[PDB]
Amino acid sequence: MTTRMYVINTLSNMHVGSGEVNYGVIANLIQRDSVTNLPNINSSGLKGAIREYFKENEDLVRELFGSAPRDEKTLPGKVRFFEANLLSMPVRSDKVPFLMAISDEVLQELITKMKFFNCEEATQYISHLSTLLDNIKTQAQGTDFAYVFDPLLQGAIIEEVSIRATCPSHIPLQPSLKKLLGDRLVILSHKYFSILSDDNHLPVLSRNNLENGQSANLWYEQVLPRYSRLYFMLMDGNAQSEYLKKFRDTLCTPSTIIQIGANASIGYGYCQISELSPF
Amino acid sequence: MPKNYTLQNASNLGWLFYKDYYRQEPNVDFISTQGKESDTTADFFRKTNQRITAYQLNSESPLVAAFNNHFGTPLQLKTIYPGLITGSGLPHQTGSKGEFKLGFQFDYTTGLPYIPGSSIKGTLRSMFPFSLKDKGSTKRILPEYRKERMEYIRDLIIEVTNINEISDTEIQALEYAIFTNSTPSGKTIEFSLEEKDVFYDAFVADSKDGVMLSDDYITPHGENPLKDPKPILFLKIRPDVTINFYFKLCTTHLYKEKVCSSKQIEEIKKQNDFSSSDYKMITAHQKRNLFEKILLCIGIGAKTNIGYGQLKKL
Amino acid sequence: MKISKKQIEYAIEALRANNIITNDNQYPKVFKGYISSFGAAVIQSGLIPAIIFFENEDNDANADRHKIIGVLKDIINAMRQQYTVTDATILVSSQIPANYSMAQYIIEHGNTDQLLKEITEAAVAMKLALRMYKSE
Amino acid sequence: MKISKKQIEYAIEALRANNIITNDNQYPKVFKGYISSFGAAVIQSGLIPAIIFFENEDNDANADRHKIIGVLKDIINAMRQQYTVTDATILVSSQIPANYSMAQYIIEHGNTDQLLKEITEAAVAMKLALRMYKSE
RNA sequence: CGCCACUUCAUGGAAAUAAAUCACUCACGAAUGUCUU
């Protein structure tokens, strides 16, 4: 009841700038986790974007998010927003346009987070994800692996000639886990996923500034690829029930699209937020 | 596999063009000078280019359908033949024979050719008077730039909407509201969530009967006509290909040459001294028509001066 | 990625040793674009295509582009000279032969992340080192 | 920390001496952003890359960005002038030569913990002293 | 009318630029001002 896990499905190339200076090729990098070095959204940015979406409902924002800055009455927000961590990232291939890529360490982190935070429907997900991770570890036996669960994706090149996909027939993929993580799922080793998600491999978009049709500036912007999945934790801090119901209804409505990150005017950070479906 | 891109049987076009293009194969050499000019290297690159230029796109594509669901009703325009080029400045070159020398703009996830929303926004803004920044270098051409573009914007607005007369300050306010979402200055207008202009990515929608990517040549002849030319091979979007432009546009309210919010304009209307002569309104449909006219006028992409990237109504 | 001061020192000596920096602490203005374009090519097309393009000696370019690949090789050699014993067990500490083609060295050693990371760090170091001197 | 009045005085004198503030107590607007961004660049990147970026002349910028590096060098020189010369002290009091770029000095004068501390303090003093003046 | 091919396969420019650099609130509140031998 208190804690729910929400999945973020991005519909365009999303950029949450870290704001730091990079003197290499990429001038603008994206936010990364302080521990795992994976792309993420700061909880402040998530809360700001969601508050911007709900700004019209003044009572709901005041009860859930808190008081507006520099208001005379500073009242704390009741709902607690946790940072969104990368769940699945699309990887380019030769057999299919893109595949859903997740590492064993990402799965273990998700299992640990569900154990610690005690999500609403966490028990079945933890059980099945632990079973899947144990099967993957048994099959790998300490080596690098790229495991697909579709027999047609055998021998697929996951963005790099070194990484080739093998299909272990013994390991089953439950349909709810497929829905959570994504179709055409590949389980990568930590080394492979770190290589595929580092600064030399993440997609970059080139932009230039034109003055009377002549280029004045030029820079590269790192982006999180479209259709990437991130999970964040929402804690119900004794907030009012009806406002909470309205919040979850609007948030999980299929017609709802939320903008998170930078470059809103050029259609960058548009996402769909989904709740953890019961298993 | 070879045609009809889809999501189940395809190779990521950006992947093929950038990462898999220069894969190291047995008996294929392009490190040495002899290898780069050899016929084996030319055959290798010819096969790679043929793989690139064999994919079609159906109108009922689940990718394009998902794009339509996410970003709304598209603006469908059709490519004419010089071709269409996007991302020409992306580095893709080694010095070999039969390879694509210029870059191409591919979506990372889907792999489809696309035009980033930044490109569309900049192209549309370039035909507005206040696109050029007031700077020391630009101050020589600054007056003529705005003078020429303001007339064009005026006729286009009078064409697309019912407004009989528009002022220079009104045009400035409209431009800064559409592109900057602010006032001409640095002031912010209290806008609602829906009162924002968003320029999504233009995607290739449907190649009716044929592939969507073709190969083209630009062959510069140097300043010496007695020297040999220089064949440059690049990848272009084929003519007769449907491009889907996605926008999120709102209604702009102008009262006394200033941009007003929707609730602001409601309050202004409710007042006693409401002059209907000073009230102007451009709707989202009229904004779309304005953008369509701009696109049909100048086009989008690279080498637009020499014809590339011109569009016709579907 | 943080560029160390020793990497910038290596870049300075490599740019002097090949002949990017003249005796009066000046360099031709086109090498700036050369190094920036090499970084962009590495990030976009890949390590091997960029190395092959900028390694070519039969160019129509204004200046000697292959000298930037030479500077790359010298910087990588200097970096590998200071690899620790425990680093040599994980990382390849062998010196790249002077006359060896860099592209074929990378190909024969694979496409390992070590070489790509070293190339990117050395390219950033070269850019920073050129930023310290005057463009003719 | 707390604001050091002597460092603020040094910053005032260096800003006047490096032709940042005109005869009227006024400065070009972009220098505020320059001073503010210098500290963030120093923290996020290395000290050497930040000093290279800001000391770089012939750049494409709205004003003379290397003037802030000149101001920093003048402030560091004043601090080293005021340093107490006693045994069992850590700070080295030798001044930075006027013919020396700051990048070169930091390059060949490593173990730069003292230099890092001085540069951060001088940046803070510059930021706080620039507020006495008006931006055009 | 017959017979017959060679040549050329990227250079130059832009490689980040400005705005915001913490803001508001709380800055001590209550008890004890002598007590027991």
DSSP codes, C26-71: B--THHHHHHHHHHHHHHHT-HHHHHHHHH-SS--SSS-THHHHHH
Distance CA B2, CA B224 (A): 43
Q: Identify the three-state secondary structure at position A272.
A: strand
Contact (Cβ atoms closer than 8 angstroms) between residue B295 and residue B123: yes
Distance CA C76, CA D116 (A): 27
- Count other Cβ atoms within 10 Å, centred on residue A276: 18
Q: Which helix (H) or strand (E) holds D30?
A: helix D30-44
* Chain A residues with CB within 8 Å of chain D CB: 20-23
Joined tokens for residue B244 = 């889907």
Q: Cβ–Cβ of C3/A23 closer than 8 Å?
A: yes
Q: Which residue has the tokens 């009572």?
A: A59
Q: How far is the CA of D121 from the C1' of E28 (A)?
A: 32
- Strand-pair category, A214-222 with A26-28: parallel
DSSP string, A116-132: HHT-TTHHHHHHHHHHH
The beta strand positions in chain A, using DSSP E, are 3-10, 26-28, 40-41, 80-81, 84-92, 98-103, 146-148, 185-188, 204-211, 214-222, 229-235, 258-259, 270-275
Q: Which parts of B2-141 fold into alpha helices (H)?
A: 13-18, 33-37, 39-52, 62-71, 117-125
Distance CA B272, CA C64 (A): 76
Contact (Cβ atoms closer than 8 angstroms) between residue A247 and residue A50: no
Q: Which residue has the tokens 């006027």?
A: D98
Q: Which residue has the tokens 């999500």?
A: A119
- Count other Cβ atoms within 10 Å, centred on residue B307: 12
- Provide CB contacts within 8 A for D52, sequence distance 6+: A23, C8, C128, C131, C132, D103
Q: What residues of chain D lie within 8 A of the CB of A22, using their CB? A: 45
Residue in C35, C113, C109, C107 with CA at minimum distance from that of residue C69: C35
Residue in A223, A256, A257, A217 with CA at minimum distance from that of residue A14: A223
Half-sphere exposure of D25 (CA within 13 A, CB side): 8
Q: For chain A, what's the residue count?
A: 279
CA distances from C5 to B189, C81, D87, D97, D104 (A): 48, 16, 29, 20, 10
Contact (Cβ atoms closer than 8 angstroms) between residue D52 and residue C128: yes
Contact (Cβ atoms closer than 8 angstroms) between residue A117 and residue A233: yes
Nearest to C48 among B22, B33, B92 (CB): B22
Sheet strands side by side (includes B258-260): B258-260, B252-255, B279-282
Distance CA C32, CA A198 (A): 26
- Distance (Å) from the alpha carbon of C53 to chain B's nearest alpha carbon: 4
- Provide CB contacts within 8 A for A75, sequence distance 6+: A62, A66, A67
SS (H, E, C) B143-166: HHHHHHHHHHHHHHHHHHCCCCCC
Q: Cβ–Cβ of A23/D44 closer than 8 Å?
A: no
Joined tokens for residue B195 = 């009162």
Joined tokens for residue C40 = 């962009």
Chain A contacts in chain B segment 207-236 (CB below 8 A): none
Measuring alpha carbon to C1', the residue closest to nucleotide E25 is A74
The beta strand positions in B164-308, using DSSP E, are 198-199, 202-207, 213-218, 232-237, 241-245, 247-248, 252-255, 258-260, 279-282
Q: Round to the nearest angstrom and report the end-to-end CA distance of chain A.
A: 16
Q: Identify the three-state secondary structure at position D118.
A: helix
- Provide CB contacts within 8 A for B25, sequence distance 6+: B44
- Count other Cβ atoms within 10 Å, centred on residue D58: 12
Q: Which parts of A161-277 fold into alpha helices (H)?
A: 175-181, 190-197, 241-252
Q: How far is the CA of D32 from the C1' of E21 (A)?
A: 9
Contact (Cβ atoms closer than 8 angstroms) between residue A107 and residue A88: no
Q: At what angle do helices B284-298 and B142-160 cross, to 10 degrees?
A: 120
Q: What residues of chain C lie within 8 A of the CB of B95, using their CB? A: 52-53, 56, 59
Residue in A278, A232, A242 with CA at minimum distance from that of residue A39: A232
Residue in C4, C1, C5, C63 with CA at minimum distance from that of residue C34: C63
Does residue A52 belong to the interface with chain B, where contact is any CB pair within 8 Å?
Answer: yes
Q: Which amino acid is at C28?
A: P
Residue in C86, C64, C77, C55 with CA at minimum distance from that of residue C11: C77
Contact (Cβ atoms closer than 8 angstroms) between residue B283 and residue B272: no
Q: Identify the three-state secondary structure at position B204.
A: strand
Nearest to D52 among C2, C131, C134 (CB): C131
Cα torsion for C83, C85, C87, C90, to the nearest 10°? 130
Nearest to A97 among B7, B20, B87 (CB): B7
Q: Cβ–Cβ of A97/B11 closer than 8 Å?
A: yes
User: Using the 8-state DSSP alphabet, how is residue B177 labeled?
Assistant: I
Joined tokens for residue B29 = 């050499």
- Count other Cβ atoms within 10 Å, centred on residue A252: 14
Chain E bases under 7 Å from protein CB? Answer: 7-25
Contact (Cβ atoms closer than 8 angstroms) between residue C128 and residue C11: yes
Distance CA B94, CA A141 (A): 41
Q: Which residue has the tokens 């190094």?
A: C35
Q: Cβ–Cβ of C116/A220 closer than 8 Å?
A: no
Q: How far is the CA of B134 from the C1' of E33 (A)?
A: 72
Contact (Cβ atoms closer than 8 angstroms) between residue B108 and residue A13: yes
Neighbours of chain D (3+ CB pairs under 8 A): A, C
Joined tokens for residue B150 = 């303001």
Q: What residues of chain A lie within 8 A of the CB of D49, using their CB? A: 23
When computed from its CA atoms, the radius of gyration of chain A, rounded to whole angstroms, is 20
Contact (Cβ atoms closer than 8 angstroms) between residue B125 and residue A275: no
Distance CA B89, CA B262 (A): 42
Q: Could you tell me which chain A residue has the CA closest to the CA of D45?
A: A21
Backbone angles phi and psi of A148, in degrees to 5:
-105, 155
Nearest to B133 among A159, A211, A257 (CB): A211
Neighbours of chain A (3+ CB pairs under 8 A): B, C, D
Q: Cβ–Cβ of C39/A23 closer than 8 Å?
A: no
Q: Which helix (H) or strand (E) holds B77?
A: strand B75-79
Q: Which parts of A95-252 fold into alpha helices (H)?
A: 104-117, 122-140, 175-181, 190-197, 241-252
Distance CA C88, CA C98 (A): 20
Joined tokens for residue D101 = 């770029």
Joined tokens for residue B155 = 């006729």
Positive or negative torsion for Cα D50, D52, D54, D55: positive
Neighbours of chain B (3+ CB pairs under 8 A): A, C
* Residues β-bridged to residue B176: none
Nearest to C111 among A26, A162, A206 (CB): A162
Q: Could you tell me which chain A residue has the CA closest to the CA of C43?
A: A200
Sheet strands side by side (includes B114-115): B114-115, B202-207, B241-245, B75-79, B311-313
Backbone angles phi and psi of B241, in degrees to 5:
-115, 135
- Provide CB contacts within 8 A for B113, sequence distance 6+: B13, B86, B104, B105, B106, B107, B203, B204, B212, B213, B237
Joined tokens for residue A58 = 């003044």
- Distance (Å) from the alpha carbon of C3 to chain D's nearest alpha carbon: 7
Task: Give the rounded distance of the alpha carbon of C55 from its chain centre.
Answer: 11
Nearest to C131 among D45, D56, D107 (CB): D56
Q: For chain D, what's the residue count?
A: 136
C76-85 burial code (b ≥16 CB/10 A, e <16):
bbbbbeeeee
Joined tokens for residue B188 = 């912010």
Contact (Cβ atoms closer than 8 angstroms) between residue C102 and residue C69: yes
Q: Which parts of B38-141 fold into alpha helices (H)?
A: 39-52, 62-71, 117-125
- Strand-pair category, B75-79 with B311-313: antiparallel
Chains A, D: CB contacts within 8 A come to 15
Residue in C100, C20, C110 with CA at minimum distance from that of residue C55: C100
- Distance (Å) from the alpha carbon of A115 to chain D's nearest alpha carbon: 35
* Residues β-bridged to residue C60: none
Contact (Cβ atoms closer than 8 angstroms) between residue B254 and residue B281: yes
Residue in A269, A193, A260 with CA at minimum distance from that of residue A49: A260
Distance CA B243, CA B74 (A): 9
Q: Round to the nearest angstrom and report the end-to-end CA distance of chain B.
A: 28
Distance CA C136, CA A42 (A): 45
Distance CA A207, CA B116 (A): 10
Joined tokens for residue D55 = 């000391």
Q: Cβ–Cβ of D58/C134 closer than 8 Å?
A: yes
Distance CA B302, CA B283 (A): 30
Task: Give the rounded distance of the alpha carbon of D70 from its chain centre.
Answer: 7
Backbone angles phi and psi of C133, in degrees to 5:
-120, 175
Q: Could you tell me which chain C residue has the CA closest to the CA of D102?
A: C132
Distance CA C82, CA C91 (A): 12
Q: Which helix (H) or strand (E) holds C106?
A: helix C102-108
Q: Could you tell me which chain C residue has the CA closest to the CA of D45?
A: C2
Chains B, C: CB contacts within 8 A come to 48
- Distance (Å) from the alpha carbon of C130 to chain A's nearest alpha carbon: 13
- Count other Cβ atoms within 10 Å, centred on residue A81: 23
* Residues β-bridged to residue A6: A232, A275
- Provide CB contacts within 8 A for B66, sequence distance 6+: none
Measuring alpha carbon to C1', the residue closest to nucleotide E24 is A70
Q: Round to the nearest angstrom and report the end-to-end CA distance of chain C.
A: 30
Neighbours of chain C (3+ CB pairs under 8 A): A, B, D
Q: How far is the CA of A63 from the C1' of E31 (A)?
A: 37
Contact (Cβ atoms closer than 8 angstroms) between residue C42 and residue C119: yes
User: Using the 8-state DSSP alphabet, how is residue B188 labeled?
Assistant: B
Residue in A8, A86, A3 with CA at minimum distance from that of residue A251: A8
Q: Could you tell me which chain D residue has the CA closest to the CA of C10?
A: D107
CB-based burial of residue D23 (10 Å sphere; 0-12 exposed, 13-18 middle, 19+ buried)?
exposed
Q: How far is the CA of C2 from the C1' of E28 (A)?
A: 45
Distance CA B19, CA B7 (A): 19
Q: What residues of chain C lie within 8 A of the CB of B22, using their CB? A: 45-46, 48-49, 52
- Distance (Å) from the alpha carbon of C104 to chain B's nearest alpha carbon: 7
**Which technique was used to obtain these atomic coordinates?**
cryo-EM
- Provide CB contacts within 8 A for B288, sequence distance 6+: B75, B247, B249
Q: How far is the CA of A235 from the C1' of E30 (A)?
A: 36
Distance CA D10, CA B130 (A): 43
Distance CA A140, CA C18 (A): 48
Q: Identify the three-state secondary structure at position D6.
A: helix
Q: Identify the three-state secondary structure at position A76.
A: coil
- Provide CB contacts within 8 A for A68, sequence distance 6+: A61
Distance CA C3, CA D48 (A): 8
User: Using the 8-state DSSP alphabet, how is residue C74 labeled?
Assistant: H
User: Using the 8-state DSSP alphabet, how is residue B129 labeled?
Assistant: G
Residue in C115, C27, C25, C17 with CA at minimum distance from that of residue C74: C17
Distance CA C6, CA C73 (A): 16
Contact (Cβ atoms closer than 8 angstroms) between residue B89 and residue B81: no
Joined tokens for residue A59 = 């009572």
Angle at A43 between CA A39 and CA A49, to 5 degrees: 100
Q: Round to the nearest angstrom and report the end-to-end CA distance of chain D.
A: 31
Q: For chain B, what's the residue count?
A: 314
Joined tokens for residue B222 = 């140097």
Does residue B197 belong to the interface with chain A, where contact is any CB pair within 8 Å?
Answer: yes
Joined tokens for residue D90 = 């850590």
Distance CA B22, CA C45 (A): 9
Contact (Cβ atoms closer than 8 angstroms) between residue C104 and residue C111: no
Distance CA B116, CA B86 (A): 9
> For testing the chain A interface, which of D37, D43, D45 should be mutated: the one with the most A CBs within 10 Å?
D45
Q: How far is the CA of A217 from the C1' of E18 (A)?
A: 12
Distance CA B117, CA B105 (A): 12
Q: For chain C, what's the residue count?
A: 136
- Count other Cβ atoms within 10 Å, centred on residue D36: 14
Q: Which amino acid is at C45?
A: S
- Strand-pair category, A26-28 with A185-188: unpaired
A84-121 burial code (b ≥16 CB/10 A, e <16):
bbbbbbbbbbbbbbbbbbbbbbbbebbbebbeebebeb
Q: How far is the CA of A80 from the C1' of E29 (A)?
A: 30
User: Using the 8-state DSSP alphabet, how is residue B110 labeled?
Assistant: T
Q: How far is the CA of D33 from the C1' of E20 (A)?
A: 9
Distance CA A68, CA A75 (A): 9
Distance CA B109, CA D11 (A): 52
Contact (Cβ atoms closer than 8 angstroms) between residue A181 and residue A87: yes
> For testing the chain D interface, which of C128, C130, C136 should be mutated: the one with the most D CBs within 10 Å?
C128
Q: Cβ–Cβ of B126/A213 closer than 8 Å?
A: yes
- Provide CB contacts within 8 A for A69, sequence distance 6+: none
In chain A, how many H helices and how many E strands?
7, 13
- Provide CB contacts within 8 A for C9, sequence distance 6+: D107
Distance CA A218, CA A207 (A): 6
When computed from its CA atoms, the radius of gyration of chain C, rounded to whole angstroms, is 14
CB-based burial of residue A159 (10 Å sphere; 0-12 exposed, 13-18 middle, 19+ buried)?
buried
Q: How far is the CA of A75 from the C1' of E27 (A)?
A: 20
